[PDB]
Design a protein around this nucleic acid. Structure first.
Ligand SMILES: Nc1ncnc2c1ncn2[C@@H]1O[C@H](COP(=O)(O)OP(=O)(O)O)[C@@H](O)[C@H]1O
Ligand SMILES: [Mg+2]
Length: 647
RNA sequence: AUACGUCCUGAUAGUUAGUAUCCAUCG
RNA sequence: CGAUGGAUACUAACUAUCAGGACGUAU
């Protein structure tokens, strides 16, 4: 076992955390996870008690899916306490009370995402008085209507005697771009919501964490996009003519599904965009993928859509015919036809490789792109370049990771991803078999990465926190930070960089010597304009306007009907103005035919339409529970045919 | 010539509504 | 394939500030 040795600032922070509820602000790579580990290990005596006798339990909450495994492995390795792991893949929602009781009895420490915790707490399956300790990972995401805020709202009503301690872990404080003056208001709202005092040790400010923390060097690379191959510009003109023709077709010719031709035009301008950003070959690859999808679709299509698809097929035929003239890949010159920006990226990678060839240290690099499909086509492109056998591309290993949206029905998505495959790719990267990674914002936040030397930003950062975490993604010594900037964008980029640097400076200076939060601010905010539905009182399960729409949609999904069609409530909106002439909104909905209740349900009026939908949802839920379909714990019941006949 | 008040236009900051796109969870 | 959450961009409205134009009053 590792045989860790405590450091003075670690114990200094631990004593303060034990004394009072606090929020930890530390630089990246410092080891706040170990602070949480030690704090958990110190208070392990209470967890030994049985659940039936009131023995409390300690929870851990995290944002995304891979972090669930990441933190759980650390907590299992460094402690003898038993831990449990649950995520939404195994369909934990369809369980009943007894199974949850057994799971709670088995495990002492539980780690899950926020939504599952909220779903469990709302249905009355657990009592907040049984929580020993709760840990907030990435405590800067608790804003507006985030699930963290709803869990806090649940926490507020509990009596102070049995309230558990609250501890916060973060690397960034402000979620978005803020004015230098508004930073105080943002941090005040944060510490008012969490009901804890953010702390900063005098030790971490001086030399202590400075040696352990790392800072990269920043490089600004300018590029121009107006210049492009003359043939490529000819192709863009051709697609402009084609889109004009398609728009004329849409305007002149009636369409049974105008959204279908809109989809044709929009996938077209997507293809034009890929040509602009990447080049003709990648555009043709997307074109052949789309023609494969067209072959899939042509099995079941009507005459008009198939005709316009045939015309667009002729357009791709013309595009490929023109591409045959400039088949530079067949001429073994792949550099020429690609976009200049990709050329600049290739040149930068060549410079890095020429620098590191003498270095015995191996290569490790991360690439950030906004769009999943863009990352996929980029991965294909670098894979092909490596397959080209050329010297500067032979050593390149490329992989991609994106968010997963598993479909129970077929409804196939072109992108390929699986949670098991996700963890396999992650461990493959950790072993070091892959050096270059192209990823979206899934891995951008908080997840530890192996020793990396280079981080390159394909796209510009969007807010302060994204810039901070992307800078902190590099952990090894002598790291590199590179951002590409368009020629006309450099002034705004520089001014935003100055704003970010001054924001970081004032954040560092302001965090020291701040007074404890005021509970008057904690009970000050109130957004719930209506009380929830409490049939059995405080103990029994409740339903809040936030979850009522999801409840109705889930129950409608559970209705016995055809697989092809989905029963969806029809929403009718009524606008009215009172004697005050303010904008009042009121909603009304109708259940499908499978509902025993047929009369439309209406709700109270209020200025916003979303609240009108929520009010109608809550009224419908209360009426449906009154009818008797919903069970004791207010969850939708799969009323089988035998169940319907018996009732 | 100035200040105040009212109206209009333009810009900035905040709030609200709508629209579009993207990402992440829930199924 | 639906919902929720977040981010960005656009539009519209309201509030506040500034600038400019017009009118009334006072100095
Ligand atoms: N006493 C210790 N023994 C072993 N490793 C340590 C010790 N203290 C810090 N570390 C290392 O420091 C790193 C801290 O990173 P992490 O645990 O992800 O949290 P954070 O990113 O908040 O610093 C860990 O990877 C851990 O290996
Ligand atoms: Mg971290």
């Amino acid at each position: 076992e590792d045989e860790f040795t405590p450091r003075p600032y670690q114990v200094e922070l631990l004593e303060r955390a034990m004394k009072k509820n606090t929020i930890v602000c530390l630089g990246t790579g410092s080891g706040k996870t170990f602070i949480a580990v030690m704090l958990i290990k110190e208070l392990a005596h209470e967890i030994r008690g049985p659940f039936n006798e009131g023995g409390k339990r300690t929870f851990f909450l995290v944002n995304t899916v891979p972090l669930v495994n990441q933190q759980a492995k650390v907590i299992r390795k460094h402690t003898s306490l038993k831990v449990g792991e649950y995520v939404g893949d195994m369909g934990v929602d369809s369980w009943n009370k007894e199974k949850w009781n057994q799971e709670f009895e088995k495990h002492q420490v539980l780690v899950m995402t926020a939504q599952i915790f909220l779903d469990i707490l709302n249905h009355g399956f657990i009592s907040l008085s049984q929580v020993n300790l709760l840990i907030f990972d990435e405590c800067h995401h608790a804003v507006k209507n985030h699930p963290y805020r709803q869990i806090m709202r649940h926490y507020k009503n509990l009596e102070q005697n049995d309230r558990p301690r609250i501890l916060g872990l973060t690397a960034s404080v402000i979620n978005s771009k803020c004015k230098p003056n508004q930073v105080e208001k943002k941090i005040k709202e944060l510490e008012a919501t969490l009901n804890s005092r953010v702390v900063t040790a005098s030790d971490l400010e001086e030399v202590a964490v400075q040696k352990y923390a790392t800072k990269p060097k920043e490089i600004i690379v300018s590029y121009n996009s107006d210049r492009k191959s003359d043939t490529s510009e000819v192709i863009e003109n051709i697609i402009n003519q084609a889109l004009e023709q398609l728009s004329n077709i849409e305007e002149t010719s009636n369409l049974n599904d105008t959204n279908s031709l809109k989809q044709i035009k929009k996938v077209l301008r997507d293809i034009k965009n890929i040509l602009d950003e990447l080049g003709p070959w990648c555009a043709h690859r997307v074109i052949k993928s789309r023609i494969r999808q067209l072959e899939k679709r042509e099995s079941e299509t009507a005459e008009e859509l198939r005709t316009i698809r045939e015309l667009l097929q002729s357009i791709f035929e013309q595009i490929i015919n023109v591409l045959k003239n400039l088949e530079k890949l067949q001429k073994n010159n792949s550099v020429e036809f690609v976009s200049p920006k990709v050329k600049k990226l290739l040149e930068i990678l060549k410079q890095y490789f020429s620098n590191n060839n003498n270095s015995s240290k191996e290569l490790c690099g991360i690439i950030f792109v906004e769009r999943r499909y863009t990352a996929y086509v980029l991965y294909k492109l670098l894979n092909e370049l490596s397959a080209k056998r050329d010297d500067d591309f032979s050593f390149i290993k490329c992989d991609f990771v994106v968010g997963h949206n598993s479909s129970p029905s077929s409804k196939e998505k072109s992108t390929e991803m699986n949670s098991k495959k996700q963890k396999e790719v992650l461990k493959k990267f950790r072993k070091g078999e892959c050096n270059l990674l192209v990823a979206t914002s899934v891995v951008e936040e908080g997840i530890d990465i192996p020793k990396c030397n280079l981080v390159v930003r394909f796209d510009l950062p969007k807010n302060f926190r994204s810039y901070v975490q992307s800078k902190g993604r590099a952990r090894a010594k002598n790291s590199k930070y590179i951002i590409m900037v368009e020629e006309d964008e450099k002034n705004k980029f520089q001014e935003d960089l100055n704003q970010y640097q001054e924001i970081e400076k004032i954040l560092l200076r302001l965090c020291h010597n701040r007074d404890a939060p005021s509970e008057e601010d904690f009970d000050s905010f109130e957004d719930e304009l209506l009380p929830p539905y409490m049939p059995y009182g405080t103990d029994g399960p409740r339903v809040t306007m936030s979850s009522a729409i999801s409840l109705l949609h889930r129950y409608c999904s559970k209705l016995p009907s055809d697989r092809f069609t989905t029963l969806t409530p029809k929403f009718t909106y009524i606008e009215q103005n009172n004697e005050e002439e303010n904008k009042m909104f009121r909603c009304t909905l109708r259940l499908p035919i499978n509902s025993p209740l047929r009369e439309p349900i209406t709700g109270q009026p209020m200025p916003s339409k979303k609240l009108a939908k929520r009010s109608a949802a809550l009224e419908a839920c209360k009426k449906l529970h009154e009818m008797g379909e919903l069970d004791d714990h207010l969850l939708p019941v799969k009323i089988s045919r035998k169940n319907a006949e018996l009732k």
